[PDB]
Amino acid sequence: LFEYPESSQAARVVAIISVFVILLSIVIFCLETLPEFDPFFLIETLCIIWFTFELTVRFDVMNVIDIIAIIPYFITLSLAILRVIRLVRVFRIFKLSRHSKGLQILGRTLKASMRELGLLIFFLFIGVVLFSSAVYFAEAGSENSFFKSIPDAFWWAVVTMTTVGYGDMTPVGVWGKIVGSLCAIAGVLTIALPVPVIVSNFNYFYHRET
Amino acid sequence: LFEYPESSQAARVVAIISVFVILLSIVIFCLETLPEFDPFFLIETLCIIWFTFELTVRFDVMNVIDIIAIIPYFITLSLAILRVIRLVRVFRIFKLSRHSKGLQILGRTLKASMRELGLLIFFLFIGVVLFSSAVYFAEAGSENSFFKSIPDAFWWAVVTMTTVGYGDMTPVGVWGKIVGSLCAIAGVLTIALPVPVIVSNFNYFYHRET
Amino acid sequence: LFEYPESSQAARVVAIISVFVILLSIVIFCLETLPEFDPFFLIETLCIIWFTFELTVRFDVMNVIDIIAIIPYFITLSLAILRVIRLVRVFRIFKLSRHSKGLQILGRTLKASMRELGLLIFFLFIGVVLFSSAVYFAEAGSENSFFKSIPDAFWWAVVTMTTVGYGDMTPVGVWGKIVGSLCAIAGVLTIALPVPVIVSNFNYFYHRET
Amino acid sequence: LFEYPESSQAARVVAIISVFVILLSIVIFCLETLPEFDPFFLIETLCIIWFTFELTVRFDVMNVIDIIAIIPYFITLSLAILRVIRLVRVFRIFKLSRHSKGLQILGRTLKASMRELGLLIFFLFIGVVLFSSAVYFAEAGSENSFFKSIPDAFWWAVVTMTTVGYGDMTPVGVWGKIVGSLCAIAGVLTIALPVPVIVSNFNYFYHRET
Amino acid sequence: GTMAAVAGLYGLGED
Ligand SMILES: [K+]
Ligand SMILES: [K+]
């Protein structure tokens, strides 16, 4: 048989069934985590049974995603590894890439621009270390310093360079505010540079799709 | 008559009267909601009379907006349905599109790139689910965890992915701050990719307008 | 005379003196507002004498700025009009445009793209009114509603559309957070449309001057 | 010798050793600042011995960075100068530029675009002064003013112009919120204007290096 | 983006 990869009149209903099952599994995940809540386990078992059935029908990276989606359930049959498997259960969301034409374009854009992504993470790491050390040593003299240590300032440097915002910020001297202004400017610039190459690769793969 | 569709032969008086009545209705809406406050109903009835007269003399999406602008006033003549009709009264603001040549360019841009908006909402959905699950499972081990559940973290993931800012963020461990840094960078990238196609569509329609 | 426009050698030192006097007047302004504080008035009178001497040597918008720079000092020789004149004293900072070759490029960019700036302010007004009405009617049913009225929500809609961040946001229901996410994404899309035309013309003017 | 500046099979060993030593020095910095903490001084002495050996073997700007990386260690062998030297110790992070081909592209982009960087800092200074004085005089009439002085408003104007977010903003009147909305719009426009030439210079150097 | 700040590079929009 092996009609699944092709999209025929009898196959498109199978694709709709797979997309609905994936969305139902994601919903069961986000709902079973809720404080108000066995009945979820039955739906999760049905979803994993459909997943294993599709994988056996197909038995690249999408196959690795199909395997990773099923692995955590079979593992369940210190505490940190249990929380890690409960977290890696989320990877079921990536099976939408099998059906989504646009998500594959994003994956090809990421594979085609790993160097720019590494350059972006490098610039963020350099700016974070620099502005964290600067704001900490600016605050070192004041009594009851806002930043206990340079690593403590990493979160403030990250939220400032990305223009997310640290929220409350008042208990800070003039030098810390000057370093924060420079941090915001430099973070806007460093975020602004690698991005256009990635946007160009995405637009290229997208228009190649059409 | 049929003077309304063309703004010519001294029909500009009718167009300025329509724009003034629309702005007056919007102001009456925003002031009627004020805590300090019958006379507002009189001005609202006058604006509705002008709207229904313009529509009945005029007799596409613009006619649908002209109908929706006047339906809620007549519907008034579960409390949630009352709140919904009071909210849908706002749609009078879209009557300006008939007079604003630039707003129609925005409507043509939104129509030409519906796939772009869908891809953008899809990327935000995937990123919100992923980073919410990550930050929640990172916070699960702490006492008095800041995030009661994955759905509870959806708002934090949205405000971080868009670089709006969650505000206060202290009661969070190192792993949550790491996930938040990754969330800010990934939101930067995910909102940086579909948008330029929409900008190109808007720039093309704007140059076509002149 | 008339060496001021055509800078040469002796006319160059006059330009550096004018720039120093302008910066000194701005510093005297920002220091005169300080809580810790006659001596400031003497430096202000000296800067006003230099400004009036340059203006009388001069005898377009540049002369208008030169007039506005000295008007408040001579007006001083309800309380709200006094606060307004103390505010309009700040316009001395625009005297730098005569010496800053880049600031004139910014002024030509603003004059050459007024239609785009107005279209941007229009889109912001539309989005602010719409999302403010939405978030208010979403919060109306909750006890101790966060938003007393739609106008009260205008500041939240403005900081969300521009992604500045409202700060603490917890006392809000699910519908208000949904409207806030939609407001954030729509704010990305609105501001990011008009802007490229203002860049294109700014870049044109800049490189033409180059 | 001069074995360092080639790509010989022995040379990659020395390159990876220098990169690991630079990263270990940055780590020793960031952990020696920690509240929980001689053993760090031994690793610092080893990193400085390696840096001085690399410098004495090597013997522009790169040599100046290599000098600055080792100067603070030998300086130790008012308190404010001690804080300044402890801060300038961070410059070891810039030794990575010798190995990172992308960091040199960033340095060439900065050297080649000093003029627009100065224009951007100029626009930020102008907008900060203007909006700070505006929000201060708008808030001057309220009892218990949120802004004690125009300089006190500089941090708010900076975080708003860059859309980082001041945090809580409620104790402010209508006029201050209006000035804040204008500040957010103008800051987005003034930040966006000079970036694109910097991005174009960066992509030019990145493709010339390709 | 918001402050992702795309620098265009879509052929300047071809206009
Ligand atoms: K932002
Ligand atoms: K923000």
Side-chain angles (χ1 to χ4, degrees), chain A residues 1-3 5-58 60-114 116-142 145-208, chain B residues 1-11 13-58 60-114 116-142 145-208, chain C residues 1-58 60-114 116-142 145-208, chain D residues 1-58 60-114 116-142 145-208, chain E:
Chain A
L1 201 63
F2 196 59
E3 61 76 13
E6 187 263 318
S7 66
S8 78
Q9 183 66 41
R12 68 182 66 253
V13 72
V14 185
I16 296 305
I17 283 302
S18 278
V19 171
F20 163 71
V21 161
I22 287 154
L23 288 181
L24 167 68
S25 81
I26 295 165
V27 162
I28 289 299
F29 193 51
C30 293
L31 260 67
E32 66 155 40
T33 199
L34 273 177
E36 293 83 3
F37 316 93
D38 182 59
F40 286 151
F41 188 69
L42 176 58
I43 313 175
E44 182 93 348
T45 303
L46 297 194
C47 290
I48 297 296
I49 292 299
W50 167 265
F51 287 178
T52 45
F53 162 70
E54 182 65 26
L55 170 64
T56 52
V57 172
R58 314 191 81 120
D60 63 358
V61 64
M62 283 186 253
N63 317 133
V64 184
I65 280 162
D66 291 331
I67 294 161
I68 281 285
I70 303 168
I71 282 297
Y73 184 11
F74 288 178
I75 290 177
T76 53
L77 272 72
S78 197
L79 189 142
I81 62 170
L82 287 183
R83 277 197 288 110
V84 169
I85 73 164
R86 286 212 55 207
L87 166 60
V88 72
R89 257 149 60 82
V90 66
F91 275 24
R92 57 189 58 186
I93 190 167
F94 290 138
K95 304 173 81 193
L96 291 180
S97 78
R98 184 161 291 291
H99 312 276
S100 163
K101 286 76 58 185
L103 209 55
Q104 298 165 345
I105 289 162
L106 170 66
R108 294 209 268 271
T109 303
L110 292 193
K111 172 195 201 73
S113 66
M114 281 284 189
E116 293 83 3
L117 285 185
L119 208 67
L120 169 61
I121 294 302
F122 194 34
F123 290 170
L124 273 294
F125 153 80
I126 277 177
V128 159
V129 166
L130 173 59
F131 289 116
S132 304
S133 298
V135 73
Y136 165 79
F137 281 119
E139 301 295 41
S142 81
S145 306
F146 194 25
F147 295 116
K148 324 322 291 193
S149 46
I150 296 181
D152 190 341
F154 284 168
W155 173 243
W156 169 90
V158 167
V159 303
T160 293
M161 293 177 71
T162 47
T163 80
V164 170
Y166 189 57
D168 187 333
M169 182 55 217
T170 181
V172 159
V174 191
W175 305 107
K177 300 183 180 304
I178 290 152
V179 175
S181 305
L182 288 180
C183 185
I185 296 312
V188 169
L189 293 175
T190 56
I191 292 280
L193 295 194
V195 163
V197 193
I198 307 156
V199 174
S200 304
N201 298 1
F202 172 80
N203 174 237
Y204 180 76
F205 277 86
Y206 185 43
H207 286 335
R208 264 181 31 91
Chain B
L1 190 53
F2 197 70
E3 193 185 2
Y4 300 104
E6 281 76 350
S7 308
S8 298
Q9 69 267 357
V13 60
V14 166
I16 200 60
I17 295 299
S18 282
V19 175
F20 155 77
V21 172
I22 284 152
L23 295 174
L24 165 64
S25 86
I26 286 169
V27 160
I28 285 303
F29 189 52
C30 293
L31 299 203
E32 151 175 50
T33 198
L34 272 189
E36 283 94 316
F37 322 101
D38 179 62
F40 277 172
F41 187 75
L42 175 59
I43 304 173
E44 182 65 26
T45 294
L46 286 200
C47 290
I48 284 306
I49 285 299
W50 169 257
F51 286 168
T52 195
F53 159 76
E54 151 176 340
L55 171 70
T56 198
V57 174
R58 184 151 311 140
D60 47 346
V61 60
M62 301 215 168
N63 304 347
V64 178
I65 283 179
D66 293 18
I67 284 280
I68 301 299
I70 81 166
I71 295 299
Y73 169 94
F74 284 107
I75 281 180
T76 67
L77 268 65
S78 179
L79 194 140
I81 208 70
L82 301 194
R83 290 230 295 282
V84 163
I85 69 172
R86 264 201 91 181
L87 165 60
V88 69
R89 256 154 52 89
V90 66
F91 276 27
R92 54 196 42 179
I93 190 167
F94 296 124
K95 288 182 74 37
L96 286 178
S97 68
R98 194 181 294 284
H99 310 291
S100 170
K101 284 83 61 183
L103 194 56
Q104 326 187 9
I105 293 162
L106 177 60
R108 294 181 200 310
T109 299
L110 291 193
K111 184 162 91 93
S113 53
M114 286 286 204
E116 272 56 40
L117 271 43
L119 199 64
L120 167 64
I121 296 308
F122 194 43
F123 290 170
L124 276 296
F125 165 70
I126 279 177
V128 167
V129 172
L130 182 53
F131 290 118
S132 309
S133 303
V135 71
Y136 165 78
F137 280 113
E139 294 294 328
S142 80
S145 46
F146 188 73
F147 293 108
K148 309 338 195 177
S149 43
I150 298 182
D152 190 340
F154 283 171
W155 175 242
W156 166 91
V158 163
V159 299
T160 302
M161 282 203 57
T162 57
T163 75
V164 165
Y166 185 60
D168 178 356
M169 252 305 307
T170 53
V172 169
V174 188
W175 303 106
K177 297 178 183 307
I178 293 162
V179 174
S181 306
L182 293 179
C183 190
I185 290 155
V188 159
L189 294 175
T190 51
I191 77 171
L193 303 190
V195 168
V197 188
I198 307 162
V199 162
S200 312
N201 272 25
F202 177 81
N203 184 317
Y204 155 76
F205 277 87
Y206 194 50
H207 163 261
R208 183 177 178 86
Chain C
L1 211 45
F2 204 60
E3 60 175 326
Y4 284 71
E6 281 56 61
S7 51
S8 176
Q9 188 274 331
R12 170 185 177 178
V13 74
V14 168
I16 210 69
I17 290 299
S18 286
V19 171
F20 160 67
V21 172
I22 288 155
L23 294 192
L24 163 71
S25 78
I26 292 167
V27 167
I28 291 301
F29 189 48
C30 295
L31 259 56
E32 173 177 30
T33 188
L34 273 193
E36 293 83 3
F37 319 104
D38 169 61
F40 281 178
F41 184 67
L42 196 47
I43 306 169
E44 191 56 10
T45 294
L46 290 196
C47 295
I48 284 301
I49 293 300
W50 172 256
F51 286 168
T52 194
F53 170 71
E54 151 178 43
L55 177 70
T56 196
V57 165
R58 290 319 179 71
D60 46 17
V61 59
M62 302 285 257
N63 284 49
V64 173
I65 283 172
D66 291 15
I67 289 292
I68 293 176
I70 65 169
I71 281 299
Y73 175 90
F74 288 105
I75 283 180
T76 57
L77 262 56
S78 181
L79 192 139
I81 199 67
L82 293 200
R83 282 224 316 280
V84 163
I85 69 167
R86 293 172 52 55
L87 168 59
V88 68
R89 259 151 64 87
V90 66
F91 272 33
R92 55 196 42 181
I93 190 167
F94 294 129
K95 287 185 69 37
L96 288 180
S97 80
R98 187 184 307 287
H99 310 283
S100 159
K101 64 182 181 293
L103 213 51
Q104 324 191 4
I105 300 159
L106 173 63
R108 294 202 265 272
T109 300
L110 292 194
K111 173 194 181 26
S113 58
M114 270 317 188
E116 281 76 70
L117 282 192
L119 184 63
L120 166 66
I121 291 310
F122 191 37
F123 288 169
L124 268 294
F125 155 81
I126 299 294
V128 159
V129 172
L130 173 56
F131 290 115
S132 315
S133 315
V135 69
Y136 165 81
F137 278 119
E139 301 305 81
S142 71
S145 43
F146 194 23
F147 296 104
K148 324 312 301 173
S149 42
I150 298 174
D152 197 335
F154 283 164
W155 173 244
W156 168 92
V158 159
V159 301
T160 296
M161 291 213 78
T162 62
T163 75
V164 167
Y166 182 62
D168 183 318
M169 252 305 307
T170 56
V172 170
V174 185
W175 305 105
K177 297 178 180 310
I178 289 158
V179 175
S181 62
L182 284 181
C183 187
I185 297 156
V188 193
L189 291 203
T190 46
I191 303 301
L193 295 194
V195 163
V197 193
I198 307 156
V199 172
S200 300
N201 49 60
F202 171 84
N203 186 297
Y204 195 84
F205 283 97
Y206 187 37
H207 283 89
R208 196 180 55 119
Chain D
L1 187 74
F2 293 99
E3 204 268 347
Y4 293 174
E6 311 86 320
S7 71
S8 303
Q9 183 283 350
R12 54 221 191 100
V13 170
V14 171
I16 198 66
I17 295 299
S18 282
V19 171
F20 150 78
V21 174
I22 290 154
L23 292 176
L24 160 77
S25 81
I26 296 168
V27 165
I28 282 302
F29 189 44
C30 292
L31 282 71
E32 90 185 340
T33 193
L34 271 188
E36 282 76 351
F37 321 100
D38 191 54
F40 284 159
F41 183 63
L42 180 54
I43 306 168
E44 192 86 30
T45 311
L46 287 196
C47 284
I48 291 303
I49 283 300
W50 172 253
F51 286 175
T52 197
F53 170 65
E54 161 179 344
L55 184 62
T56 195
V57 163
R58 190 160 317 282
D60 45 355
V61 59
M62 293 177 70
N63 283 66
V64 178
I65 287 170
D66 295 11
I67 289 287
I68 291 182
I70 74 166
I71 281 300
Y73 173 92
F74 290 104
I75 282 187
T76 77
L77 187 47
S78 187
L79 191 147
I81 67 171
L82 294 184
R83 288 221 309 271
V84 175
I85 67 156
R86 294 211 41 181
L87 166 58
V88 77
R89 205 140 51 72
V90 68
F91 275 28
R92 53 195 44 176
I93 190 167
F94 293 127
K95 297 188 52 61
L96 291 178
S97 83
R98 185 185 301 280
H99 312 273
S100 164
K101 300 91 195 171
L103 212 50
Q104 308 174 357
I105 295 164
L106 173 68
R108 294 204 265 280
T109 310
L110 294 196
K111 173 196 171 24
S113 50
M114 272 313 186
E116 318 86 348
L117 273 186
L119 207 64
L120 166 70
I121 291 306
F122 192 38
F123 291 171
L124 272 295
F125 152 80
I126 279 182
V128 159
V129 164
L130 173 62
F131 289 115
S132 297
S133 63
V135 70
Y136 164 76
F137 281 115
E139 291 316 90
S142 76
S145 306
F146 201 65
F147 295 112
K148 296 340 181 185
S149 44
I150 298 177
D152 205 58
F154 281 165
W155 176 240
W156 169 91
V158 168
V159 298
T160 300
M161 269 196 92
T162 61
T163 79
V164 165
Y166 181 60
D168 200 27
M169 187 66 204
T170 61
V172 167
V174 188
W175 305 105
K177 301 188 180 304
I178 291 158
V179 174
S181 308
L182 285 179
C183 185
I185 296 306
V188 163
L189 294 174
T190 53
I191 289 288
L193 280 197
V195 165
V197 295
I198 296 177
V199 160
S200 73
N201 287 171
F202 177 80
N203 307 356
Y204 174 106
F205 281 87
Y206 191 49
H207 289 162
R208 148 174 310 270
Chain E
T2 46
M3 282 306 247
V6 64
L9 275 66
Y10 201 100
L12 174 149
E14 214 185 1
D15 295 84

